[PDB]
Amino acid sequence: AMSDSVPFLKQPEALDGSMAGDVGFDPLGFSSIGDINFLREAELKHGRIAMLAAAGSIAQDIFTFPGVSKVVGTAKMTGVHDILVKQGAMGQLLLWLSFLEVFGTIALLETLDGKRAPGDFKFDPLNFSKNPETFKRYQLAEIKNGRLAMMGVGGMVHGYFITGKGPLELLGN
Amino acid sequence: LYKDGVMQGKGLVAVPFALAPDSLPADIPGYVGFDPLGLSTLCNLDFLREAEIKHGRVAMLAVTGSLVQDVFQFPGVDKVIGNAKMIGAHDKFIAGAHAGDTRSFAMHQIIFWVGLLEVLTMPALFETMNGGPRQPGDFKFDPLGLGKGDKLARKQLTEIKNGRLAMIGVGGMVHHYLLTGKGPLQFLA
Amino acid sequence: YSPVPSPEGTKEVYWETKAPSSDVLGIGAGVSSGNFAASSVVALMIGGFCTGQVIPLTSDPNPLFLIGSFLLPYSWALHVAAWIQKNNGK
Amino acid sequence: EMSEAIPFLPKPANIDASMPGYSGFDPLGFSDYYNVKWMQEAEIKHGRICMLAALGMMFPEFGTLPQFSSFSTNPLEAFYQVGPAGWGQILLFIGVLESFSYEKVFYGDSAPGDLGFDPLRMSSNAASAKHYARAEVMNGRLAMIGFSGMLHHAILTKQGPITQIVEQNFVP
Ligand code: CLA
Ligand code: CLA
Ligand code: CLA
Ligand code: CLA
Ligand SMILES: CC1=C(C#C\C(C)=C/C=C/C(C)=C/C=C/C=C(C)/C=C/C=C(\C)C#CC2=C(C)C[C@@H](O)CC2(C)C)C(C)(C)C[C@H](O)C1
Numbered sequence: 001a002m003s004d005s006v007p008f009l010k011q012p013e014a015l016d017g018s019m020a021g022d023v024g025f026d027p028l029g030f031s032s033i034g035d036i037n038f039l040r041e042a043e044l045k046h047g048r049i050a051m052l053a054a055a056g057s058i059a060q061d062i063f064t065f066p067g068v069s070k071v072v073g074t075a076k077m078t079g080v081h082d083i084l085v086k087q088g089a090m091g092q093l094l095l096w097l098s099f100l101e102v103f104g105t106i107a108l109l110e111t112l113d114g115k116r117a118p119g120d121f122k123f124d125p126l127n128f129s130k131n132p133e134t135f136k137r138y139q140l141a142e143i144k145n146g147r148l149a150m151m152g153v154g155g156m157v158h159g160y161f162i163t164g165k166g167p168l169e170l171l172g173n
Numbered sequence: 174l175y176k177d178g179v180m181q182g183k184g185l186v187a188v189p190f191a192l193a194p195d196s197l198p199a200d201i202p203g204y205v206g207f208d209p210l211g212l213s214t215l216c217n218l219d220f221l222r223e224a225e226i227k228h229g230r231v232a233m234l235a236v237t238g239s240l241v242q243d244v245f246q247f248p249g250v251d252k253v254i255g256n257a258k259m260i261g262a263h264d265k266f267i268a269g270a271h272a273g274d275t276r277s278f279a280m281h282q283i284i285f286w287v288g289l290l291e292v293l294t295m296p297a298l299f300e301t302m303n304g305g306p307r308q309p310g311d312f313k314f315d316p317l318g319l320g321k322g323d324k325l326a327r328k329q330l331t332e333i334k335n336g337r338l339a340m341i342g343v344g345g346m347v348h349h350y351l352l353t354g355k356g357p358l359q360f361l362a
Numbered sequence: 363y364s365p366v367p368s369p370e371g372t373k374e375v376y377w378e379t380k381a382p383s384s385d386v387l388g389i390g391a392g393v394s395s396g397n398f399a400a401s402s403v404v405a406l407m408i409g410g411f412c413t414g415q416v417i418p419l420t421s422d423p424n425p426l427f428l429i430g431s432f433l434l435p436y437s438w439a440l441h442v443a444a445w446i447q448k449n450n451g452k
Numbered sequence: 453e454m455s456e457a458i459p460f461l462p463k464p465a466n467i468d469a470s471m472p473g474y475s476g477f478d479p480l481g482f483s484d485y486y487n488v489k490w491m492q493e494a495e496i497k498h499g500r501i502c503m504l505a506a507l508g509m510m511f512p513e514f515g516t517l518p519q520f521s522s523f524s525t526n527p528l529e530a531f532y533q534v535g536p537a538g539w540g541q542i543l544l545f546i547g548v549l550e551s552f553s554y555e556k557v558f559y560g561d562s563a564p565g566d567l568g569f570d571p572l573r574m575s576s577n578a579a580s581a582k583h584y585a586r587a588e589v590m591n592g593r594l595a596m597i598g599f600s601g602m603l604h605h606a607i608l609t610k611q612g613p614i615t616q617i618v619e620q621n622f623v624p
């Protein structure tokens with residue numbers, strides 16, 4: 001059996017297709033080393049943080065919060081990070097995300113025992129998973145947008161590094 | 174095989190006083206009999222075949238490229254490259270990359286992407302050298318579906334032959350430069 | 363005397379064959395020998411290159427080459443694992 | 453049955469005429485104690501290394517590589533003038549060569565000296581194979597003696613063999 005994404009390569013042994021977005025793409029064999037549930041937690045966490053980062057880059061190009069423009073001046077995107085270490089935003093956010101990630105550490109400890117689905121924090125306040133097909137469709141869309149947001153954040157930040165303009169300042173000219 | 178026993182395969186002897194090794198089989202595309210130095214005994218046959226195919230394909234892209242590079246140039250290359258071509262350009266690209274010029278980073282982009290592709294298709298070589306179902310040269314790359322039947326066979330022969338021809342061509346197109354400069358059509362005419 | 367305790371999942375890896383079983387590679391028990399050999403070559407090149415950048419050590423060394431220099435001892439264990447997997451039918 | 457190299461001694465028991473470089477010569481009885489096939493493999497490797505070394509102690513006096521044209525024709529100086537990088541590359545290549553020898557010697561049961569390097573098939577003819585099998589060991593022993601000589605003469609004279617000959621510097 002050959003992999004669907006890479007037809008000239010053998011299908012990975014640890015990829016079953018039961019997970020969302022599994023087309024059998026693992027040429028370097030990383031799934032043989034790590035637990036697949038741990039790897040899927042890594043992928044989902046990276047993708048969700050990248051989705052929030054991409055949306056934040058687009059919005060912070062679109063508009064700024066009241067008062068932020070005096071603190072940061074004209075040093076948008078990652079240039080504010082250092083500046084906000086001088087202010088108290090970065091430390092507060094790091095503390096609260098560290099709290100949330102201690103509870104995520106407990107959740108990962110429960111994932112590794114076979115008693116928790118990967119990426120499952122059971123956070124659905126507005127009920128959307130009302131049907132088991134809509135659930136699969138949202139899982140595939142979530143994992144695809146997470147990967148797309150990883151590469152989109154890479155593009156926005158490295159283009160900001162080259163130009164100093166931003167993702168949407170570049171498209172203005 | 175395409176014209177097995179006439180154009181390739183069994184029976185054909187290229188050098189009559191230096192027979193090819195009997196380990197070298199007669200059902201590999203391109204076997205005519207020509208291994209006078211017995212170099213197929215010093216390496217794995219899958220590695221040798223796939224190395225020949227990769228050397229040939231790189232030479233084919235290079236020869237075609239050489240001709241066109243000496244003939245048609247993309248818009249705005251004249252501002253960076255100018256009147257230079259071929260073996261110089263690579264070098265001075267690095268010199269431009271050494272100078273600080275933030276727009277001459279072409280050869281680094283191509284080394285990045287080609288190295289990434291080589292790293293990701295290296296395990297295809299690794300199952301190929303264990304007698305797997307993938308044959309040397311087979312990346313299953315047929316978008317247009319033209320070689321979908323027996324027509325493949327003929328193509329295989331012709332491809333490997335053009336590869337060897339391309340392997341010669343670049344050397345001329347390089348070494349004729351290293352004495353004189355210029356380019357393939359500037360040296361022809 | 364008293365039972366000697368071990369952590370859970372400890373198996374018997376004592377070997378008298380040509381090569382040990384793949385279990386001595388722990389989490390790398392399912393990596394093929396070709397991947398190990400390729401990673402050993404790649405680690406050797408990157409570690410040697412990074413080390414050769416940091417032999418003239420300064421008071422402000424580049425952190426990236428400092429991390430990449432640790433791939434130089436990694437390649438030894440990688441080629442040992444490559445030999446182990448190659449003689450294990452992998 | 454008596455030894456044919458030393459006609460007043462008995463023939464050594466653990467060497468026979470099927471070995472290519474046999475002459476019945478074992479006055480100290482090395483074959484009586486050690487593993488004979490190991491000793492054959494070791495003799496072949498020492499002799500091959502000395503064949504390459506005996507050619508290479510003489511060859512730079514005829515001509516050098518253009519990148520090494522500034523290097524001394526004395527081998528014991530040109531050993532040091534090569535940097536650690538080139539000797540490390542040479543050692544890595546020798547290690548690549550010795551991986552096959554490690555596998556063959558410690559895990560295989562091939563003939564002594566057989567690393568599978570016969571591209572031209574010059575041992576296909578039986579009489580030719582026997583002649584080459586004996587001649588390799590003969591020229592290997594000759595190159596061992598010759599390289600030993602060239603090295604200690606180069607210690608004494610600080611010049612290569614041809615150079616020492618043509619200046620006739622024969623006395624220390
Ligand atoms: C050359 C052989 C080859 C072929 C025939 C394919 C074929 C395919 N790959 Mg694939 N792939 C290849 C090599 C190849 N791959 C290599 C070397 C890598 C890097 C390791 C990948 C990485 C990869 C990923 C990450 C993904 C695919 C996916 C796909 C599928 C979607 C088709 C598509 O969008 O085409 C367009 C594809 C490209 C532009 C990239 C490949 C470039 C090659 C050289 C061209 C091949 C195009 C192919 C003929 C189109 C198929 C025709 C038709 C079925 C649409 C398809 C079955 C996707 C999928 O659904 O799998 C999960 C996907 O997400 N591939
Ligand atoms: C591409 C977006 C996307 C999609 C489709 C999903 C899909 C899913 N998530 Mg999920 N998630 C996402 C992003 C997404 N997530 C991000 C970014 C985070 C980090 C905050 C999370 C954190 C998260 C947790 C913690 C959990 C889930 C869960 C779930 C599942 C339950 C069904 C559900 O709520 O989906 C419905 C989702 C949508 C309809 C998408 C909402 C899109 C909104 C409306 C658009 C927002 C616009 C934006 C803010 C404005 C941009 C500004 C502009 C200037 C750029 C489902 C598979 C749960 C799970 O797996 O267990 C059941 C669970 O516990 N998610
Ligand atoms: C062996 C490959 C090769 C190499 C190393 C070079 C090297 C160079 N070329 Mg050239 N070139 C090549 C082939 C090559 N050429 C081919 C085949 C063509 C088309 C006829 C061109 C056309 C071309 C032009 C028009 C220009 C260059 C230029 C340049 C210079 C700058 C680099 C650049 O932007 O490349 C650009 C290279 C390309 C656009 C060629 C891409 C064609 C690819 C190979 C097609 C592959 C398709 C295939 C389906 C992919 C399979 C993937 C996988 C399955 C194997 C440099 C000297 C520039 C220069 O300095 O000129 C003076 C310039 O203006 N190249
Ligand atoms: C024991 C073997 C041995 C060793 C340790 C050395 C060591 C050295 N040689 Mg030397 N050399 C050797 C044998 C050896 N040589 C032989 C046999 C020849 C004759 C070809 C030469 C010819 C030679 C020249 C011309 C020069 C050196 C130089 C040097 C020095 C620099 C390293 C270098 O470039 O090597 C170069 C070594 C070689 C080119 C020998 C490679 C022989 C290979 C391993 C055998 C090939 C087998 C087979 C024919 C392969 C084809 C098979 C095919 C038919 C199927 C160094 C002190 C240089 C120097 O510093 O001069 C003062 C220099 O200019 N050597
Ligand atoms: C494997 C084989 C092939 C091979 C070939 C390869 C290249 C094999 C090459 C074998 C070569 C290296 C043989 C060299 C022998 C030189 C020895 C005998 C001499 C030392 C001289 C001594 C006597 C002396 C000296 C003396 C010194 C002490 C003092 C001086 O005052 C006097 C004096 C100068 C007289 C190939 C690759 C084609 C493939 C094929 O399928 C199989």
Ligand SMILES: CC1=C(C#C/C(C)=C/C=C/C(C)=C/C=C/C=C(C)/C=C/C=C(C)/C=C/C2=C(C)CCCC2(C)C)C(C)(C)C[C@H](O)C1
Binds near residue numbers: 153289
């Ligand atoms: C905050 C802050 C900072 C920062 C920072 C940040 C925010 C850094 C963020 C970096 C990120 C998000 C990088 C992403 C890189 C993505 C890559 C390389 C994608 C590769 C794709 C590959 C290889 C292949 C793709 C593919 C292709 C095309 C072909 C094959 C198949 C496929 C796999 C699909 C500092 C430290 C810099 C300083 C600053 O003062 C403060």
Ligand SMILES: CCCCCCCCCCCCO[C@H]1O[C@H](CO)[C@@H](O[C@H]2O[C@H](CO)[C@@H](O)[C@H](O)[C@H]2O)[C@H](O)[C@H]1O
Binds near residue numbers: 543
């Ligand atoms: C097949 C045979 C392989 C065996 C050789 C591989 C190991 C290489 C050993 C070291 C090679 C060069 O290392 C060498 O570096 C310096 C020059 O570069 C030498 O430095 C000095 O060496 C000699 C001192 O005894 C002097 O005659 C030299 O003129 C001087 O350069 C070091 O004393 C030595 O360590």
